[PDB]
Structure 1
Amino acid sequence: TRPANHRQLTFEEIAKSAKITVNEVELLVMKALSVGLVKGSIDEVDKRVHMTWVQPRVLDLQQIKGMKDRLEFWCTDVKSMEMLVEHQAHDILT
């Protein structure tokens, strides 16, 4: 659900969203990691976790439009940098 940034999250938020007491979430996330469906790390004294990768899923014709958009306004930066460099060093090998 979360963005790709900002995806650190806290024990109590899991405990609410899974309706399990706090003291179990450590063993739950250990289990999740051990079967490789999610990858990350834990901080027990802050009571926080830092997930970093998650198994892909199927997604529909409405979600892919965001892919299209982010790809377009990514590619624009490549084009800009190429047009810059091939000018700024024009003389060194024209």
Structure 2
Amino acid sequence: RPANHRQLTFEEIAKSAKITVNEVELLVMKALSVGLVKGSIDEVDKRVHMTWVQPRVLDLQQIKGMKDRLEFWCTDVKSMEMLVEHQAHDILT
């Protein structure tokens, strides 16, 4: 999931990770010892928060279909660069 709700609830963890509520904390403190993900996990809602991670090895279908992020970035930061410059166009001066 690239999307947000990076303050994930513990629920998918305790369902699909074959772990319990008393051991999600060890599940991510042992990962703090590992050092590939360092979440700021919520503990008033018990939510397992997502910070930066070590992503994958290969997604060749997403190495091809990363255009929806790469070309997204390219043409959209390009277009909004053209828009900022186009609103400040004739102070080229």
TM-score w.r.t. the length of structure 1 is: 0.76
**Structure 2 unpaired stretches of 5+:** none
Query: How far did 1:74 drift?
Result: 1.9
Mean Cα deviation higher: 22-31 or 11-20: 11-20
Q: Does 1:41 align with 2:68?
A: no
Query: How far did 1:12 drift?
Result: 3.0
SS in 1 for 2:51: strand
1:20-45 deviation digits (Å, cap 9, x = unpaired)? 22211111211111221112111222
1:36-90 deviation digits (Å, cap 9, x = unpaired)? 1112111222110211111132113211122123211221223323433444444
TM-score w.r.t. the length of structure 2 is: 0.76
Count of residue pairs brought into register by the alignment: 93
Larger Rg: 1
Q: Which has the higher strand share?
A: 1
| Segments of 4+ moved more than 6 angstroms | none
Distance 1:93 1:7, change over 3 A: closer
Over the aligned positions, Cα root-mean-square deviation in angstroms equals 2.1
**Distance in structure 2 (CA, Å) of the matches to 1:28 and 1:85:** 46
